[PDB]
Amino acid sequence: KREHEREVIQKAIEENNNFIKMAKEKLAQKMESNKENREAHLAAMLERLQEKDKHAEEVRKNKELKEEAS
Amino acid sequence: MRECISIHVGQAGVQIGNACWELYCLEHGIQPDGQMPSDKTIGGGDDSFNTFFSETGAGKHVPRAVFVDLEPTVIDEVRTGTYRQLFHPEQLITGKEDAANNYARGHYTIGKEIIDLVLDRIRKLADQCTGLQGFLVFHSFGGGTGSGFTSLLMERLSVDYGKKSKLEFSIYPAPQVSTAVVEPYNSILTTHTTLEHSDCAFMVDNEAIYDICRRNLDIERPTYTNLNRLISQIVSSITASLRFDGALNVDLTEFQTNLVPYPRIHFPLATYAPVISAEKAYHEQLSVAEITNACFEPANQMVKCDPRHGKYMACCLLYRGDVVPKDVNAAIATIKTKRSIQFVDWCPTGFKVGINYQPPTVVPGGDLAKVQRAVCMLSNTTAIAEAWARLDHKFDLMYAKRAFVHWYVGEGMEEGEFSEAREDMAALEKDYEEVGVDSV
Amino acid sequence: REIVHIQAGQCGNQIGAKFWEVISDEHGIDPTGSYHGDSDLQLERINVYYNEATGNKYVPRAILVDLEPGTMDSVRSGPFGQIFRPDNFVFGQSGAGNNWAKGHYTEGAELVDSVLDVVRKESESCDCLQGFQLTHSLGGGTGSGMGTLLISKIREEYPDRIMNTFSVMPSPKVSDTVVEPYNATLSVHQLVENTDETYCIDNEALYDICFRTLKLTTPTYGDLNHLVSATMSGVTTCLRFPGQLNADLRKLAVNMVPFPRLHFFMPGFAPLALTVPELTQQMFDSKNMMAACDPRHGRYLTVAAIFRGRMSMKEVDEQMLNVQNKNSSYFVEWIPNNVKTAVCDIPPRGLKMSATFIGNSTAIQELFKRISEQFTAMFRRKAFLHWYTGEGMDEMEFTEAESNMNDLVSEYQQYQDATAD
Numbered sequence: 002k003r004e005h006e007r008e009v010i011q012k013a014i015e016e017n018n019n020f021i022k023m024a025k026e027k028l029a030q031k032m033e034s035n036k037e038n039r040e041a042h043l044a045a046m047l048e049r050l051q052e053k054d055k056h057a058e059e060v061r062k063n064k065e066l067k068e069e070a071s
Numbered sequence: 072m073r074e075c076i077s078i079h080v081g082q083a084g085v086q087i088g089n090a091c092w093e094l095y096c097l098e099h100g101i102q103p104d105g106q107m108p109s110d111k112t113i114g115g116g117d118d119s120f121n122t123f124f125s126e127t128g129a130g131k132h133v134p135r136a137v138f139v140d141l142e143p144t145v146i147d148e149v150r151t152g153t154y155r156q157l158f159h160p161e162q163l164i165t166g167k168e169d170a171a172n173n174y175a176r177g178h179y180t181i182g183k184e185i186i187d188l189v190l191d192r193i194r195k196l197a198d199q200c201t202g203l204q205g206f207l208v209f210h211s212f213g214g215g216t217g218s219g220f221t222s223l224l225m226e227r228l229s230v231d232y233g234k235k236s237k238l239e240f241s242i243y244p245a246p247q248v249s250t251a252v253v254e255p256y257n258s259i260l261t262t263h264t265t266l267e268h269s270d271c272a273f274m275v276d277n278e279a280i281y282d283i284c285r286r287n288l289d290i291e292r293p294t295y296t297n298l299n300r301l302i303s304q305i306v307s308s309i310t311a312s313l314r315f316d317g318a319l320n321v322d323l324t325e326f327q328t329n330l331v332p333y334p335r336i337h338f339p340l341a342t343y344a345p346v347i348s349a350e351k352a353y354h355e356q357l358s359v360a361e362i363t364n365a366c367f368e369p370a371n372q373m374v375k376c377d378p379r380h381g382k383y384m385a386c387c388l389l390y391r392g393d394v395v396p397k398d399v400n401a402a403i404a405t406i407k408t409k410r411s412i413q414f415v416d417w418c419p420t421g422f423k424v425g426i427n428y429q430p431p432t433v434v435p436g437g438d439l440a441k442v443q444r445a446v447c448m449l450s451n452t453t454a455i456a457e458a459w460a461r462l463d464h465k466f467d468l469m470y471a472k473r474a475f476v477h478w479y480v481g482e483g484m485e486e487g488e489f490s491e492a493r494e495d496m497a498a499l500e501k502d503y504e505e506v507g508v509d510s511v
Numbered sequence: 512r513e514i515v516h517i518q519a520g521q522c523g524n525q526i527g528a529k530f531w532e533v534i535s536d537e538h539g540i541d542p543t544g545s546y547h548g549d550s551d552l553q554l555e556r557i558n559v560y561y562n563e564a565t566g567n568k569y570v571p572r573a574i575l576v577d578l579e580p581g582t583m584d585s586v587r588s589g590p591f592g593q594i595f596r597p598d599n600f601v602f603g604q605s606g607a608g609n610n611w612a613k614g615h616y617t618e619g620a621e622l623v624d625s626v627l628d629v630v631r632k633e634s635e636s637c638d639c640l641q642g643f644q645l646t647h648s649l650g651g652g653t654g655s656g657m658g659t660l661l662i663s664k665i666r667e668e669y670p671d672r673i674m675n676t677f678s679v680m681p682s683p684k685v686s687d688t689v690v691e692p693y694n695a696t697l698s699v700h701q702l703v704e705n706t707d708e709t710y711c712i713d714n715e716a717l718y719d720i721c722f723r724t725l726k727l728t729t730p731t732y733g734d735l736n737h738l739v740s741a742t743m744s745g746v747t748t749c750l751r752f753p754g755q756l757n758a759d760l761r762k763l764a765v766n767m768v769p770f771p772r773l774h775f776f777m778p779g780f781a782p783l784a785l786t787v788p789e790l791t792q793q794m795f796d797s798k799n800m801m802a803a804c805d806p807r808h809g810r811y812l813t814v815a816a817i818f819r820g821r822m823s824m825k826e827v828d829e830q831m832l833n834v835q836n837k838n839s840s841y842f843v844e845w846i847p848n849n850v851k852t853a854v855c856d857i858p859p860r861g862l863k864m865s866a867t868f869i870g871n872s873t874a875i876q877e878l879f880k881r882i883s884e885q886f887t888a889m890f891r892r893k894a895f896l897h898w899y900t901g902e903g904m905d906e907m908e909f910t911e912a913e914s915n916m917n918d919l920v921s922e923y924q925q926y927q928d929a930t931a932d
């Protein structure tokens with residue numbers, strides 16, 4: 002009976018610790034996944050804007066070649 | 072004497088906190104500067120009111136509370152208001168930018184920047200407790216902070232305090248006073264993520280409170296202040312057994328044993344009476360039987376739903392003021408012979424009763440008559456699942472077109488979390504269905 | 512908290528100056544920048560649009576931009592001309608010749624970095640920047656072309672802030688002519704990708720209102736701009752006074768924009784006995800719209816209503832519920848509770864009470880369809896293209912802009928046709 006009493010309380014400790022652990026790991030995965038997602042969103046936004054800039058240069062370079070003909 | 076720490080999150084949470092703490096100060100004889108003349112033990116003690124208030128050697132009684140919001144203007148009014156001396160400045164915590172009605176900003180983008188400071192501040196409160204019982208967490212479903220930051224906080228509290236009890240007071244949205252089209256999204260997301268981290272949650276349907284103020288107090292167009300004063304009476308009824316002692320007093324945790332048959336089925340329906348104006352209360356003494364009867368009138372519930380069309384799994388009556396068991400028992404026998412109170416078949420049908428002898432108090436310049444006796448009924452009924460049904464339906468309408476979803480995806484969330492949250496709600500609605508089916 | 516204001520080009524600076532005069536009066540700030548008001552509610556949120564300098568002086572957080580000095584000099588002499596920060600005038604000389612390409616790619620490109628220097632200065636000292644509002648027209652060259660360039664550049668440096676525009680659409684009824692459809696279409700192309708919320712201020716509508724409703728046979732830009740400023744004051748009141756609803760630019764966008772591209776709003780105003788039931792009927796009527804579109808020809812995705820003055824809150828709630836009940840077919844069923852209402856005690860100048868309306872309606876396609884038609888009738892003949900190729904652009908960009916705008920139209924139609932079932 003004493004052995005069973007010891008197993009019950011150890012089982013209770015083990016489940017509380019497993020609950021805490023499970024919660025800790027899931028939060029960490031969510032915050033990590035979220036950070037990566039958000040940064041990728043911003044990165045694609047900037048990469049579109051830097052294309053607009055590349056096309057603007059391309060346009061002024063284009064005017065400079067047709068003002069030479071002339 | 073087991074301490075309880077209250078945490079008030081976002082505008083609704085903070086403003087309800089203002090109303091609750093003012094009311095507790097009045098009930099306990101505590102002045103706006105924290106001084107309590109009737110308290111003869113200076114600098115500490117183990118009186119019932121100490122579960123909610125600590126004490127300094129200067130005789131100040133300090134709420135065991137933290138107020139948190141991601142923008143500063145609501146808490147700033149506490150900082151500069153009537154009860155500003157009540158709180159240590161470090162108990163009032165603000166960021167610079169709110170969650171813009173977006174769960175994702177509350178839980179991740181903005182919330183992550185302040186979460187560590189909040190836990191640090193809660194920790195300081197817990198360190199002053201000799202036998203912390205648990206937390207009471209006040210917040211809206213619909214706001215970005217109320218929803219997203221509260222979820223993040225509940226997850227972190229489970230990690231840091233284990234299975235230490237966490238109870239919520241949750242403001243369920245109504246269109247009469249809502250401020251965001253996306254409140255159904257935030258409600259479902261927070262309910263999903265918080266479900267496993269909460270022991271007991273008391274939902275307060277702003278529409279139920281709005282309609283009680285209009286109908287019972289004759290307020291043409293209720294403001295938050297009208298709603299919040301009513302809400303604080305209800306919150307006070309619920310916490311009174313922790314704050315006052317007495318022979319017939321029964322502890323909230325004892326009601327909780329009866330209220331929660333399975334971990335997920337933990338949303339009691341509160342009903343409160345009497346709600347009546349001074350003008351109608353005058354020369355009209357409301358007996359134990361009248362207020363008890365009012366508890367079974369759905370118009371007096373804090374959530375709109377119909378218990379007559381569901382089954383009870385528990386019924387608790389928390390009386391306060393001038394009330395003796397004889398009159399309670401007579402009143403209950405009457406209700407039993409005349410009302411549609413049907414229990415599930417696996418639960419006993421007895422009403423659990425507690426009586427706190429300290430009569431209710433009202434805030435000066437409020438709407439409620441001062442009465443000699445009041446009652447809050449807490450029931451566990453399958454009917455509360457209607458509240459989830461209504462919210463889940465609004466979620467489905469918008470989600471089928473992914474309306475507004477880009478605001479969440481842009482803050483780093485995935486569609487996966489929406490469907491996961493929605494499915495957990497579907498399973499919850501189903502759980503409430505199953506507990507009402509007769510045993511085989 | 513802080514909003515940064517940018518005004519570009521002639522139209523941009525004219526409606527911009529009117530905006531500051533009107534709100535300065537509402538806030539009790541005189542032209543010297545000194546406060547002389549009666550209500551503390553005037554100052555509670557003054558920082559949203561104003562900087563405080565020593566001497567308790569309030570300076571609009573405003574940046575004035577043009578490729579010629581004309582209008583800007585007119586501003587500096589205007590009534591509130593001295594209120595502005597002198598360093599915040601950034602004018603060139605070149606000019607844009609009503610040419611989007613010049614404003615966007617060449618001339619404007621030349622002045623842009625000096626504008627950014629001012630934006631960055633104003634931004635750096637902000638407790639917590641909300642974002643930006645730009646006033647400009649889409650028909651000219653500077654406001655349209657350089658205005659869209661500035662939006663792009665600012666977004667690159669402030670990708671996480673809200674970008675809001677007040678964009679004046681061109682009309683033959685007011686027309687500076689003649690390549691305006693090109694400028695507008697090239698502009699809308701930019702607005703669709705790079706702003707979070709655009710108020711479509713339609714000269715077609717301002718004209719029809721001055722002429723038909725106000726009974727002005729000969730409407731000046733002055734008469735148009737009274738409408739514009741009354742509107743702009745209205746749609747910013749929730750930003751400028753204490754309150755609950757749409758109190759900042761992000762919360763407004765989250766309430767108003769269900770899909771990222773569908774962010775073009777039809778604003779409305781009333782009045783143009785005046786009871787709450789009457790204000791309400793008026794702000795929802797096509798004749799009171801600042802965009803030339805009939806909302807009975809589409810469906811409302813979302814709506815914001817702002818009532819101003821002393822009136823019954825109960826009455827407002829009832830009339831607003833009544834409008835929705837009686838007109839249910841014109842509000843999409845799959846966005847519940849999509850109409851939000853705010854009431855502010857402080858009325859605009861010269862009115863006891865007023866109502867401002869902000870609608871995201873699929874009927875806004877009538878506006879884009881009208882521009883698209885005028886664009887295609889010129890483009891099919893390749894008329895005046897040389898003004899644009901002459902700065903380095905290919906026809907491709909015209910074809911792309913046309914397409915993107917036609918896509919926008921199709922997308923409004925898609926959601927208009929959508930059903931809950």
Ligand SMILES: Nc1nc2c(ncn2[C@@H]2O[C@H](COP(=O)(O)OP(=O)(O)OP(=O)(O)O)[C@@H](O)[C@H]2O)c(=O)[nH]1
Nearest residue numbers: 081082083086169170171172211214215216217248
């Ligand atoms: N009963 C009651 N409800 C409130 C109160 N304040 C806000 N609400 C409700 O709460 C919801 C809006 O959430 P808030 O608490 O204001 O938002 P928040 O937590 O501050 O989150 P963000 O502002 O997005 O950072 C709506 O359903 C409001 O009606 C209040 O004082 N009392």
Ligand SMILES: Nc1nc2c(ncn2[C@@H]2O[C@H](COP(=O)(O)OP(=O)(O)O)[C@@H](O)[C@H]2O)c(=O)[nH]1
Nearest residue numbers: 520521522525648650651652653654681732735
């Ligand atoms: N409502 C209004 N429209 C204007 C005003 N000034 C110009 N516009 C319109 O703006 C367009 C011309 O662009 P404009 O701003 O004047 O050229 P810009 O200086 O290159 O930006 C035309 O459609 C005009 O009708 C004004 O003060 N008010």
Ligand SMILES: [Ca+2]
Nearest residue numbers: 110112115116
């Ligand atoms: Ca003591």
Ligand SMILES: [Mg+2]
Nearest residue numbers: 081082169216
């Ligand atoms: Mg808030």
Ligand SMILES: [Mg+2]
Nearest residue numbers: 521609651687
């Ligand atoms: Mg011009």
